[PDB]
Amino acid sequence: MLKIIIPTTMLLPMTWMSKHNMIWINATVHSLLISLISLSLLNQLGENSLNFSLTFFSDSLSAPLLVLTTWLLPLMLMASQSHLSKETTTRKKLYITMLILLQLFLIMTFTATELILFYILFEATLVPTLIIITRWGNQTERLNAGLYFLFYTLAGSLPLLVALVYIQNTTGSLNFLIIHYWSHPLSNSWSNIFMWLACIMAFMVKMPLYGLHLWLPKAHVEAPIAGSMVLAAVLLKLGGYGMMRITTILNPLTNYMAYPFLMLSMWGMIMTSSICLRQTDLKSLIAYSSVSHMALVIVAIMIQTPWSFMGATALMIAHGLTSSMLFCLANTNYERVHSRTMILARGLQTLLPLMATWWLVASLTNLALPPSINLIGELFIITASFSWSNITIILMGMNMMITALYSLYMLITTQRGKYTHHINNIKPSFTRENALMALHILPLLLLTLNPKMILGPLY
Amino acid sequence: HGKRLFIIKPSGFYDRRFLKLMRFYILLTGIPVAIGITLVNVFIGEAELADIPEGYVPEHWEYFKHPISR
Amino acid sequence: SDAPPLTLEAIKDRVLYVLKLYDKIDPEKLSVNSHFMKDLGLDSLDQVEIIMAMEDEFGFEIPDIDAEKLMCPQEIVDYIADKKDVYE
Amino acid sequence: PPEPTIRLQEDPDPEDENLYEKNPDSHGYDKDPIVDLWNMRVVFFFGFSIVLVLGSTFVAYLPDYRMQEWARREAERLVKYREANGLPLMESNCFDPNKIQLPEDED
Amino acid sequence: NVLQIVRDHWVHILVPVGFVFGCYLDRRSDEKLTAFRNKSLLFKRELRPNEEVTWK
Amino acid sequence: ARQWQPDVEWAEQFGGAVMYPTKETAHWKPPPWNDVDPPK
Amino acid sequence: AFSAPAAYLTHQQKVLRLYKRALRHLESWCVHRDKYRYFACLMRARFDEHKNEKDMVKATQLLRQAEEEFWYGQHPQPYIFPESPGGTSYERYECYKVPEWCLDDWHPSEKAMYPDYFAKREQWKRLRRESWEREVKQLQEETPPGGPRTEALPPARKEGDLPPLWWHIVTRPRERPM
Ligand SMILES: CCCCCCCCCCCCCCCCC[C@@H](O)O[C@H](CO[C@H](O)CCCCCCCCCCCCCCC)COP(=O)(O)OCC[N+](C)(C)C
Ligand SMILES: CCCCCCCCCCCCCCCCC[C@@H](O)O[C@H](CO[C@H](O)CCCCCCCCCCCCCCC)COP(=O)(O)OCC[N+](C)(C)C
Ligand SMILES: CCCCCCCC/C=C\CCCCCCCC(=O)O[C@H](COC(=O)CCCCCCC/C=C/CCCCCCCC)COP(=O)(O)OCCN
Ligand SMILES: CCCCCCCCCCCC(=O)SCCNC(=O)CCNC(=O)[C@H](O)C(C)(C)COP(=O)(O)O
């Protein structure tokens, strides 16, 4: 695994020893090459895992997340090139350093054979994101947003640490392989109930769970474009990955303890999809859509059936790509209009036709149009839920209908109708933005050809 | 009838330029790949399943059929 | 479509045609600049009827606010030309 | 009230600068045309040409380490054997019962 | 020009070097996990006449 | 078009003797710039 | 559409609007032209019998019963001209309407085609640049103190002046740009 970690570390001295006007080119080229190298982790086994060493191991759940993490950095650099133009070389190098450190921590987090090492890196990712949000955000609310994004996380994560060390004091190890092979049932006890809660709540808060989702709209709205991209694409999936790893020690207590979270997610997906219908801000609408999709992923993980896990993996990958694309489109509009109010700039199809095509395809993938991987994950989760209980179909279908409604509402409001007359600074789309949009969308339509790459270890 | 009028419309130059660039680069790498793939299939062919001879242990890459996979 | 690009001459001729087919006006005294209220002695009900006839004969609707202040054939022609963007 | 209403010394908010103004064919990467052009070229070559095409072909031709055809062939020969011998295809027990020691109840 | 563009493009070589160093370190870490090489019940194999180790 | 930065009014929140002023602590005064009080 | 609205509608304007609406809806009911002409002459007669009423309270009690009767028998599916706000081709060609400022973003290779058009466009832009400076002063001096009371604009007064705020009325895209 060092053949990916070491180049990502070398990205830092290369960035800091670069010319003042070569940082973006060098960073983009070498991050793309690192993505290409990481692409060879996809050759997974039907047996246990790719156990590289005592410290790092790869799995067909970890490999798609690793590849998406490596692929996201070049897109983040391309998106950040525009709004950082008027800023000094040292500060741009610091921004690229924060992005590189975030990638390094995420890469080490997804392999992380140890649960304490996983926790340490899973919490180390917090610092670069907070600095990016509270340093290079625009509005005055960013500081407040950062505070939320901080404390919520720690409010969930501090009990987990205690639980973790407690387990190693009883089991003797926190290695995931030993934990899986030596797993034992949890008796229905108050102590075991609180151990279950301490294990679950940390990952629940970062999905986020419906009741615990307040930090996400603030953090995603006030963050710069690279921050929003990394928050929606990779950082939300840490909770799902952690739950998928940790639910192996929580059986059979998950059967009883899953009910409040299942109800919260099943009702909150409807609530947040309905919230999307009445939203005056593009970024907030995209954030609430992310909350709905992650609610579906929470349901899938809580059901803990093979089809549930496959659907959850597919949906995590598809949502990451789609939400990053949607945020990039919103930012392309914002850098022209500087308002971030959906109703202000209207009828952009007549002025930006190719960008309108990008908007249409992004809305189509968000709408879960078959045979996209978005719908593959959606349908697998829905079928698993139907087997779990036939009444889930009402909530699932209502969520599908509202999702289509708000996706097409977002498309029609911004692209169709009549152009706003007083806005005359809508310049033609740059090659950088179109390239960014294509680099988001072609991986999705190309992954629909080989779904088993993103269906997880239970395929 | 010489009543031809000017059609006010946004610039299509940049969209066409981006599409041409993307097509050129994708083809620049994909055409050699397609030609090579076809050539490999046509002349190299594919491995045929056979029983392992006694006293012979195959290499790990000899358990696969397609030459590119091998 | 295949609709001919109508000109000012056609609009003027067609407006005067509709007006001469209104029998409360004698056609020989009619002129392009003749006022409806005073030069021809028509009531405002006659004026709104004339506007309705123009609408039905040109295939589009003149809003009440614009229609209620059109008192000459020439300015009716001018309004139609401005709405339809006629060159000559 | 001789206050200036100027609360502090502040630079005026600058107006956004168009990259197309000083340079048509601007590609939206940098205000330097040479660096702009080379940034476009490297992004397009290493993103669309190298990773997107070669990586996709590499993923397409990955060897069968998941053992799909291996399992198919094993099942084929196993079904051929059991059908020939009249065995009842799949057994309901995953492990042999003779090698499991149940606890005697004596209830 | 040699000795001139090196002073301007020296940084580019670092990422590739890291990839090679990581591969070398991965192999070196592999060399410390040979306690069961050619000893698993599934792959107990008798060595070839001109073979030292089944895998490296 | 420009990133927000704290103004004078934002800075004056942190200029009091303590944070979260109360009716009792309203009459408190920040210490002198150099930690010297007039001998009176 | 073009004319600026007033603060209120006078009684005569209300009566004339009711006359037009009732005639149009009767035409919707009476499909054939001879039947429509007969009933429209009857309708005009029924308007005319109270043309000379001097009592404003009486006239206002009228037009009210009349609009109630209209709402009772108003043909819930009246005929609408296709381009009217309720027609089947109302805003059909708005997607083809492109603003004129977009031409400023054209590539020089695009402006190489149509050179005469862009030369005339440059002339128009220069005319706008000078006329605007004249227009601001003229509007400032002509507006009454305390702000405008009606959104009606004055014409040009001098020889070389242009009507104030003329650019976006003169440079409309077209009724059918494509
Ligand atoms: C502009 C108008 C159109 C012009 C173009 C017309 C031509 C259109 C044809 C292309 C689309 C039509 C669909 C037909 C597909 C043909 C190729 C397909 O069959 O091959 C696939 C093969 O492709 C791969 O399966 C999918 C590509 C993998 C995508 C990887 C992503 C690239 C990395 C980018 C970074 C990652 C970002 C996202 C993180 C998760 C599936 O083949 P498969 O039967 O299965 O086995 C391969 C061959 N074997 C048997 C030897 C093994
Ligand atoms: C706010 C946004 C979302 C945040 C996250 C919300 C999710 C947290 C929900 C917690 C999951 C369940 C907690 C406890 C489940 C135990 C089962 C219980 O509900 O059923 C009865 C439990 O009975 C009563 O509940 C006893 C406890 C009564 C006191 C609880 C307080 C009630 C409301 C508190 C909710 C506040 C939550 C937030 C706190 C800050 C059955 O009684 P009994 O079969 O005999 O005993 C079963 C347990 N044994 C077997 C281990 C002995
Ligand atoms: C987003 C903000 C959420 C904040 C945190 C939410 C998670 C809360 C989970 C509980 C926190 C601490 C739990 C302890 C960690 C696990 C350790 C463990 O399981 O050991 C138990 C110990 O169990 C406990 O001590 C639990 C005591 C909990 C005290 C703190 C209560 C916090 C609030 C309680 C109500 C809310 C609970 C769920 C809230 C969910 C989040 C909203 C049994 O060990 P022993 O006692 O040694 O062996 C038994 C024989 N003696
Ligand atoms: C088929 C659909 C339903 C139809 C039912 C509707 C029933 C409507 C019938 C009601 C009868 C009335 O007229 S309602 C009576 C309203 N009041 C008056 O008529 C008083 C003075 N009349 C005017 O001022 C007019 O404008 C006039 C002088 C005619 C022209 O004026 P000009 O000189 O400025 O054109």
Tab-separated table of C-alpha atoms and ligand atoms in Angstrom, chain A residues 151-152 155-157 159-160 162-164 166 190-192 194-199 201-202 205 212 261, ligand 3:
chain	number	residue	atom	x	y	z
A	151	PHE	CA	-18.336	19.583	17.687
A	152	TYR	CA	-21.062	17.338	16.300
A	155	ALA	CA	-19.737	14.649	20.251
A	156	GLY	CA	-20.157	11.361	18.419
A	157	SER	CA	-16.533	10.292	18.258
A	159	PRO	CA	-17.534	7.820	23.248
A	160	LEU	CA	-16.414	5.536	20.406
A	162	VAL	CA	-13.716	4.705	24.988
A	163	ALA	CA	-15.710	1.791	23.593
A	164	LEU	CA	-12.809	0.880	21.326
A	166	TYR	CA	-12.763	-1.187	26.247
A	190	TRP	CA	-27.753	-2.369	29.430
A	191	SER	CA	-23.949	-2.334	29.271
A	192	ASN	CA	-24.072	-3.968	25.839
A	194	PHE	CA	-24.523	1.409	25.647
A	195	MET	CA	-21.525	-0.240	23.974
A	196	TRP	CA	-23.673	-0.571	20.840
A	197	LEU	CA	-24.640	3.101	21.038
A	198	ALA	CA	-21.028	4.193	21.552
A	199	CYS	CA	-20.006	2.133	18.519
A	201	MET	CA	-23.366	7.091	17.096
A	202	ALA	CA	-19.967	8.295	15.837
A	205	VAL	CA	-23.487	11.636	13.037
A	212	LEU	CA	-28.214	14.801	13.628
A	261	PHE	CA	-32.433	4.604	13.494
H	3	LIG	C1	-24.192	13.520	18.565
H	3	LIG	C2	-24.026	13.593	20.083
H	3	LIG	C3	-24.117	12.223	20.743
H	3	LIG	C4	-23.295	12.139	22.028
H	3	LIG	C5	-22.847	10.711	22.341
H	3	LIG	C6	-23.937	9.688	22.031
H	3	LIG	C7	-23.508	8.250	22.338
H	3	LIG	C8	-23.758	7.869	23.797
H	3	LIG	C9	-23.336	6.430	24.094
H	3	LIG	C10	-22.925	6.233	25.553
H	3	LIG	C11	-21.695	7.065	25.921
H	3	LIG	C12	-20.751	6.300	26.847
H	3	LIG	C13	-20.969	4.791	26.748
H	3	LIG	C14	-19.775	3.990	27.271
H	3	LIG	C15	-18.877	3.486	26.137
H	3	LIG	C16	-18.933	1.959	26.005
H	3	LIG	C17	-18.305	1.247	27.208
H	3	LIG	C18	-19.134	0.041	27.671
H	3	LIG	O1	-19.912	-0.462	26.939
H	3	LIG	O2	-18.966	-0.469	28.964
H	3	LIG	C19	-20.156	-0.594	29.694
H	3	LIG	C20	-20.302	0.581	30.654
H	3	LIG	O3	-21.560	1.154	30.449
H	3	LIG	C21	-21.678	2.462	30.930
H	3	LIG	O4	-21.031	2.813	31.856
H	3	LIG	C22	-22.645	3.442	30.264
H	3	LIG	C23	-22.860	4.691	31.119
H	3	LIG	C24	-23.301	5.900	30.290
H	3	LIG	C25	-23.105	7.215	31.048
H	3	LIG	C26	-23.256	8.439	30.137
H	3	LIG	C27	-24.687	8.606	29.615
H	3	LIG	C28	-24.757	9.533	28.401
H	3	LIG	C29	-26.196	9.868	28.008
H	3	LIG	C30	-27.147	8.700	28.250
H	3	LIG	C31	-28.489	8.884	27.551
H	3	LIG	C32	-28.360	8.872	26.032
H	3	LIG	C33	-27.840	7.540	25.506
H	3	LIG	C34	-27.893	7.456	23.983
H	3	LIG	C35	-27.666	8.810	23.321
H	3	LIG	C36	-27.450	8.690	21.812
H	3	LIG	C37	-26.982	10.003	21.189
H	3	LIG	C38	-28.116	11.018	21.057
H	3	LIG	C39	-20.151	-1.895	30.493
H	3	LIG	O5	-18.877	-2.075	31.053
H	3	LIG	P1	-18.766	-2.507	32.641
H	3	LIG	O6	-19.677	-1.626	33.460
H	3	LIG	O7	-17.344	-2.330	33.109
H	3	LIG	O8	-19.206	-4.091	32.810
H	3	LIG	C40	-20.459	-4.394	33.369
H	3	LIG	C41	-20.240	-4.913	34.792
H	3	LIG	N1	-19.860	-3.826	35.676
